[PDB]
Paper text:
In a double-blinded, placebo-controlled phase 1 human clinical trial, the recombinant, germline-targeting envelope glycoprotein (Env) trimer BG505 SOSIP.v4.1-GT1.1, adjuvanted with AS01B, induced bnAb precursors of the VRC01-class at a high frequency in the majority of vaccine recipients. These bnAb precursors, that target the CD4 receptor binding site, had undergone somatic hypermutation characteristic of the VRC01-class. The GT strategy for inducing VRC01-class bnAb precursors is rooted in the hypothesis that these antibodies target the CD4bs with a similar angle of approach to VRC01 and use the same conserved contact residues. To verify that VRC01-class mAbs elicited by GT1.1 do not just exhibit similar sequence features to VRC01-class bnAbs but also target the CD4bs in a similar manner and with the same atomic contacts, we selected five mAbs for further structural characterization.
Finally, GT1.1-induced VRC01-class mAbs are structurally extremely similar to VRC01-class bnAbs. An important hallmark of VRC01-class bnAbs is their ability to accommodate the N276 glycan, which is achieved through specific SHM events as germline variants of VRC01-class bnAbs do not bind to Env with the N276 glycan. These rare but highly necessary SHM events include shortening of the CDRL1 loop or increasing CDRL1 flexibility. Hence, some GT1.1-elicited VRC01-class BCRs acquired mutations that confer strong binding to native trimers with intact glycan shields. We conclude that GT1.1 vaccination selects for CDRL1 characteristics that help accommodate the N276 glycan, without the need for the N276 glycan to be present in the vaccine.
Residue numbers in the entry:
A (entry chain L): 2 to 9, 11 to 27, 30 to 91, 96 to 106
B (entry chain G), E (entry chain H): 1 to 52, 52A, 53 to 82, 82A, 82B, 82C, 83 to 100, 100A, ...
C (entry chain A): 33 to 57, 67 to 141, 150 to 185, 189 to 309, 312 to 323, 323A, 324 to 397, 412 to 503
D (entry chain B), G (entry chain F): 520 to 545, 569 to 664
F (entry chain D): 520 to 546, 569 to 664
The structure:
């Protein structure tokens, strides 16, 4: 497919912005966080499930034809590019600038 | 409807022996218990006999406990009552009824749903 | 009022993972299997719909474990060819050689041990070009730096024999009798059986060989048809006839190597050396691929171009169709069968033979297949395919399918997809009107 | 029909054929067959002991003295025995199953004591 | 702790080939698929393919078919990715990611190598 | 006499010693062989006990049942069956009819269990 | 009180906890564990057969027809059921247990013959 993501999300700590993966099929939606200079990591295993050892601040959800990642509060440490994925298809990247 | 059609008859010696038969229709035969209830000519009702759904269980009043045999043939949907010896107090119209007992699996009854037209047994 | 009544023997079961046992009428189906009653029983369950999932069925894992264990046991009371890792002096074979097997069979002489330790003997054997790597015309066997090698016993046959997996007492095997069953989900037609049907433990990749055909139409079975990482099992409605041969008139020599141990080696090829080609019926194969495409269109769309191409790469066991034919291990080049574009005579496959086989993709345990004398015929029925789907497509109206496999469990999933094992729980309670 | 044949039949019909299921409760494969046989014996004996402590030893249809609590299931007899199968019932009462077992055990204990006291009334 | 360690950065000329290694540690290599993915020079992540080391099987993205060869050496648990006929579009960060059991979860993602293509 | 002591005795005399032959049913190549033998003995005992259980004879050595005897199986009188015959000759005589008797006993117990359940339904 | 919790308790108090202590009665390492499990099964079956031949099958508290002989223990019912534990009692009458069991078997044999005759008297 062709996943579409919001290029830039802005805010400040406690805003709790949400990132939306437009165009995904149902089930097995994964989320990845990419820090420039470091290799990425897997934030959401499938729709909402999260890897052991990752903060509870990240929580996924689905809205039928749309998936989303909810951050409980934009802590200063958490700025990066977030990619949603269904199978091999990657989005365009959401520049989460504080 | 549910129809219970007795045949039997009534002309019996005071020390004789008779058999009544009763056919049933309009419902599932093998799932109801059956009974015989007698009514003397001009007096009230008396329960006589009770048979389970499967025909294995018989119950009688004490006055006929050693004389009457109640039996059921589920395959032909018939009930029968064999009377031996008898006595002068046995003058009555006998009725089949569906009810009076139920298996543990099904709901309780302890009452009679449908009563047949019956047959008159008179001991000369 | 209602009271609790206890019932023992109620027809209740739950999914469970237990150990099943072998029954049968040799590497497989050995004397440790109990004999099979010639009268099977199948107690059809009317009004029962059960959920099946062939991709998490633990009797496939049990089947795999039993096959590995039987394979390992059959090689134990046999000759270990540790002294055979010596420096080989090999020359090419030019006696009546054809133009196809050019540089494939090599005549190799070496100093072999004999009955007495004090003496050595100069002996010669023919080896294929896949079982010889070039140290520094000096050659060694391919296994000598990775594996210990055991020779298979000459009196043990590699022919598959049907094995029935039977449940122990207290457990039951439920068979799905539906004809459109796709491997997952509810099955409205379930029967309980004492044991499974006769399952031949056939070892193959790329294409599936002998087995049970689909009853109505070609079935496409996958855990997730849209997920690239999963294999697609294609079960044929009609078999495709395949005739594989080893036309070389071979012979077997017995080289004594120790106190009662012997090595069986190739001696010479009486007559012309020709390629061990294999022929698959062409019209039947095309008709079958047409059926496969027609079934795939129900999952990918009726406006999608279906392409077949050969394996993208990997070990010989997965890029070619491996199988055991008459005791020889064939690796046939099926890149003449997966070459097509579908828009909405016979086929001859070259093959190679390998004598040094590392089965089940393990490291450390190699086996030497002793050569079989005489020509070798195999006539068999292709009953299914293992396909994968190429990912990362940029042309959205076409899909490319390539053969795959190599994980032998995905072969047995083509046979155990109808069966589930359940645990019986005969004890239960229910309300009744009776009171103790 | 044969083994588990009544599974799709109603509870009041499947309960008529309890002996059919009851009679079917009793190196690579040497140790595996031995473990399977010991497992089958252990499960059968655990079920028989569990019936024993309830006072239901030797019977397949055993009536007890534990009243039915409407919180476990409030469906009447015409919906349980005539319009339901055993598998559906097992799903329905699974959560409360252990609770029922506990009450059954307790009931037998009281009825085991009381009967003993009657045998002491000279 | 599972780790995946990759070779250093390399600079190649157009037409040359590049072999990127990925050594796995902390788990059984044979049981989990390896996935090789591009970062692309300032664009989002682009998946190129996976390899099943137990059999050696490979699955290449259609756009890279015929150009990329995937292999492994199971004796020291290292995967290899060979790119032939490099072009200026191929300069990127390249990563090896383990698979989460089966399916497409890329889990452990290695450290990455920068392949630079220039004249 | 102990185990199998009443083997040549008449069944009348032998029936009084049933406990003696009842207690003798219960007690790596040789490890697997002996565990197979012990599990075989346990399974045979439990099959016999389950078979008695489904007949309503659990816990009994001499169990009377509600199945009539059929002259076709054997027309012998009790003065020959119990007083002039051993169990071996008997068992050989009614070997061909054993399965029919077992089926009748099973059906009789099923009918009796349903009858007992109904007799407790009545209030 | 869990498994063996009444071990130091009064016999008249320990006699209410029979169920807890009855429910808990049921390659080389595989052979060892199978030997232990088969041994546990055989001990359970020997105890159940021994109860069976006494006519006490399916019961935990079984009254019998064998009178108590003062020689075994000339102790009044209070000293046994109110003051002693089961361990002290088991030590007290261990010498005679093989006698007692034998008598029990004999009484059941007589009882069975008696039952048989009554079922025929008719
Ligand atoms: C799929 O099934 C076919 C047909 O059963 C298999 O062909 C059979 O292969 C066996 C060897 O695996 C043949 O055995 C040989 O038979 C000849 C008969 O003279 C004998 O000389 C040899 O010593 C050996 O016993 C068997 O005859 C042959 N059957 C037929 C009808 O050709 C085939 O091998 C099976 N597939 C696979 C992958 O094994
Ligand atoms: C498989 O097909 C090939 C090709 O048609 C067959 O080859 C023929 O073989 C015979 C000898 O058996 C030769 O006389 C012919 O000239 C060959 N024809 C060719 C090369 O076109 C082969 O026999 C077939 N075999 C099977 C059943 O193994
Ligand atoms: C493989 O060999 C079989 C025989 O082993 C061939 O079978 C013959 O097929 C023809 C039609 O093609 C029939 O007329 C004959 O009756 C068959 N003979 C026998 C002995 O069965 C078969 O043709 C060959 N298959 C392929 C694909 O080449
Ligand atoms: C799949 O088919 C292709 C052709 O479509 C084969 O490619 C040839 O491979 C040989 C070496 O094996 C090269 O010498 C040729 O130049 C290749 N041809 C082309 C057009 O690329 C490939 O080997 C086959 N793969 C298999 C059988 O695994
Ligand atoms: C399997 O068969 C294919 C086609 O039959 C082979 O591809 C040929 O390989 C030769 C060897 O160099 C090339 O010269 C031809 O140009 C290729 N033909 C085509 C149509 O591409 C392939 O190499 C074979 N597989 C293996 C592993 O050898
Ligand atoms: C993939 O298959 C599993 C099991 O068969 C199923 O539960 C799941 O929903 C499927 N998922 C997809 C389409 O993402
Ligand atoms: C055998 O033939 C092949 C053909 O390529 C050649 O490479 C090899 O050197 C030959 N071996 C000898 C010993 O001549
Ligand atoms: C056998 O050994 C001798 C030395 O003992 C050596 O000269 C010869 O090359 C060896 N044989 C072969 C085939 O290499
Ligand atoms: C073993 O030898 C082969 C020669 O084909 C070589 O490719 C491989 O790397 C070697 N492996 C080991 C573990 O030595
Ligand atoms: C497989 O069949 C089941 C039952 O019909 C259905 O639930 C499931 O979605 C099917 N899968 C596909 C891919 O059609
Ligand atoms: C091959 O197909 C034929 C069709 O008649 C069938 O009879 C035969 O059993 C099949 N062989 C195997 C090995 O399955
Ligand atoms: C291999 O070499 C030996 C050397 O004596 C020769 O006799 C034999 O014929 C050769 N084998 C073949 C198949 O040409
Ligand atoms: C044979 O194969 C070709 C491959 O393109 C296909 O187009 C054609 O329709 C097939 N013919 C039949 C009769 O199936
Ligand atoms: C493969 O496909 C081409 C068409 O793309 C066809 O012409 C050729 O004959 C095929 N080659 C084979 C089967 O080796
Ligand atoms: C192979 O050749 C030998 C000659 O030594 C001959 O006796 C035999 O019959 C041949 N076998 C076959 C299958 O052609
Ligand atoms: C299945 O249910 C039907 C009614 O839907 C009933 O007539 C039939 O007897 C049932 N079959 C079984 C085997 O219980
Ligand atoms: C058992 O408990 C679960 C969770 O509390 C509940 O969802 C389910 O409905 C219960 N099962 C029943 C009532 O059969
Ligand atoms: C054997 O038979 C004789 C009479 O023939 C009898 O006295 C004796 O007791 C029998 N032996 C036994 C052990 O029953
Ligand atoms: C006795 O057996 C005969 C045939 O063996 C049969 O015809 C008869 O009905 C049986 N009578 C019974 C069971 O009363
Ligand atoms: C039993 O029958 C035999 C003849 O077979 C006869 O001698 C004996 O007196 C009979 N006994 C009785 C009690 O009828
Ligand atoms: C121990 O004995 C004391 C009296 O000596 C009593 O209060 C207590 O309950 C006993 N505990 C147990 C577990 O029997
Ligand atoms: C009680 O025990 C004594 C000693 O063991 C024994 O001699 C005596 O006979 C027994 N009592 C009776 C009433 O038999
Ligand atoms: C039992 O005997 C003891 C002996 O010390 C005595 O103290 C107690 O009162 C007696 N109990 C009775 C007779 O109930
Ligand atoms: C039981 O016997 C042993 C050995 O004869 C003896 O020491 C002990 O005192 C006896 N116990 C009783 C309670 O008689």
């Amino acid at each position: 497919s062709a996943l579409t993501q919001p290029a830039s999300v802005s805010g400040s700590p406690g805003q709790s912005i949400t990132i939306s993966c437009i165009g995904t099929s149902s089930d097995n939606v994964s989320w990845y966080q990419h820090h420039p200079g470091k290799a990425p990591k897997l934030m959401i295993y499938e729709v909402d499930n999260r890897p052991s050892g990752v903060s509870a601040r990240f929580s996924g959800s689905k809205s039928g034809n749309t998936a989303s990642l909810t951050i409980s509060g934009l802590q200063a440490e958490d700025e990066a590019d977030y990619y949603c994925s269904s199978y091999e298809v990657f989005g365009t990247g959401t520049k989460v600038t504080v | 409807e549910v129809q219970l059609v007795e045949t039997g008859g009534g002309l019996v010696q005071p020390g004789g022996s008779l058999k009544l038969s009763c056919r049933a229709s309009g419902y599932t035969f093998s799932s109801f218990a059956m009974s015989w209830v007698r009514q003397a000519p001009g007096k009230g009702l008396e329960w006589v006999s009770l048979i389970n759904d499967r025909g294995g269980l018989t119950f009688y009043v004490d006055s006929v406990k050693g004389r009457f045999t109640i039996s059921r043939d589920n395959s032909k949907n018939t009930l029968s009552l064999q009377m031996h010896s008898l006595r002068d107090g046995d003058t009555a119209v006998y009725y089949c009824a569906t009810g009076g007992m139920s298996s543990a699996l099904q709901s309780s009854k302890y009452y009679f749903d449908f009563w047949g037209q019956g047959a008159l047994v008179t001991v000369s | 009022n209602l009271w609790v009544t206890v019932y023992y023997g109620v027809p209740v079961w739950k999914d469970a993972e237990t150990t099943l046992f072998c029954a049968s009428d040799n590497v497989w189906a050995t004397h440790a299997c109990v004999p099979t009653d010639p009268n099977p029983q199948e107690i059809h369950l009317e009004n029962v719909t059960e959920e099946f999932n062939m991709w998490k069925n633990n009797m496939v894992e049990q089947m795999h474990t039993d096959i590995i264990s039987l394979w390992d046991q059959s090689l134990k009371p046999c000759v270990k060819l540790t002294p055979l890792c010596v420096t080989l002096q090999c020359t090419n074979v030019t006696n009546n050689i054809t133009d196809d097997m050019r540089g494939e069979l090599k005549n190799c002489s070496f100093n072999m041990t004999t009955e007495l330790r004090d003496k050595k003997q100069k002996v010669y054997s023919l080896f294929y070009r896949l079982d010889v790597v070039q140290i520094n015309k000096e050659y060694r066997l391919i296994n000598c730096n990775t594996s210990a090698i055991t020779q298979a016993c000459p009196k043990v046959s590699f022919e598959p024999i049907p094995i029935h997996y039977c449940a122990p007492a207290g457990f039951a095997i439920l068979k799905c009798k539906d004809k459109k069953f796709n491997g997952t989900g509810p099955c409205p037609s379930v029967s309980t059986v004492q044991c499974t049907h006769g399952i031949k433990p056939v070892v193959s990749t790329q294409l599936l060989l002998n087995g049970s055909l689909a009853e109505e139409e070609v079935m496409i079975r996958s855990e997730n048809i849209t997920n690239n990482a999963k294999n697609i099992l294609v079960q044929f409605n009609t078999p495709v006839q395949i005739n594989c041969t080893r036309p070389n008139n071979n012979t077997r020599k017995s080289i004594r190597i120790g106190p009662g141990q012997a090595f069986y080696a190739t001696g010479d090829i009486i007559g012309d050396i020709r390629q061990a080609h294999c022929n698959v019926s062409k019209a039947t194969w095309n008709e079958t691929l047409g059926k496969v495409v027609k079934q795939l269109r129900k999952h990918f769309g009726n406006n999608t171009i279906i392409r077949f191409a050969n394996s993208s790469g990997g070990d010989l066991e997965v890029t070619t169709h491996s199988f055991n034919c008459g005791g020889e291990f064939f690796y046939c080049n099926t890149s003449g069968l997966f070459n097509s574009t579908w828009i909405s005579d016979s086929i001859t496959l070259p093959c190679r033979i390998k004598q040094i086989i590392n089965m089940w993709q393990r490291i450390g345990q190699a086996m030497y297949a002793p050569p079989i004398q005489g020509v070798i015929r195999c006539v068999s029925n292709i009953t299914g395919l293992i396909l994968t789907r190429d990912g990362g497509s940029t042309n959205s109206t076409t899909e490319t399918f390539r053969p795959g496999g190599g994980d032998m469990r995905d072969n047995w999933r083509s046979e155990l997809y109808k069966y589930k094992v359940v645990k019986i729980e005969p004890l239960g309670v229910a309300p009744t009107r009776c009171k103790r | 029909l044969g083994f588990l044949g009544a599974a799709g039949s109603t509870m009041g019909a499947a309960s008529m054929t309890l002996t059919v299921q009851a009679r079917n409760l009793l190196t690579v494969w040497g140790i595996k067959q031995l473990q399977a046989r010991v497992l089958a014996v252990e499960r059968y004996l655990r079920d028989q002991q569990l019936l024993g402590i309830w006072g239901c030893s030797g019977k397949l249809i055993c009536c007890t003295n534990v009243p039915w609590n409407s919180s476990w299931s409030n469906r009447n007899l015409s919906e349980i025995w005539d319009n339901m199968t055993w598998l559906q019932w097992d799903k329905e009462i699974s959560n409360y199953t252990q609770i029922i077992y506990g009450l059954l055990e307790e009931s037998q204990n009281q009825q085991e004591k009381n009967e003993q006291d009657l045998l002491a009334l000279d | 702790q599972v780790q995946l360690v990759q070779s250093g950065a390399e600079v190649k000329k157009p037409g040359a080939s590049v072999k990127v290694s990925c050594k796995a540690s902390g788990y059984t290599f044979d049981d989990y698929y390896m996935h090789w993915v591009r970062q692309a020079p300032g664009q989002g992540l682009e998946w190129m393919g996976w390899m099943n080391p137990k059999t050696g099987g490979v699955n290449y993205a259609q756009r890279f078919q015929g150009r990329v060869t995937m292999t492994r050496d199971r004796s020291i648990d290292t995967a290899y990715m060979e790119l032939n006929s490099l072009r200026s579009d191929d300069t990127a960060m390249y990563y090896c990611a383990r698979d989460y059991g089966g399916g497409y979860p890329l889990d452990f993602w290695g450290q990455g190598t920068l392949v630079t293509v220039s004249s």
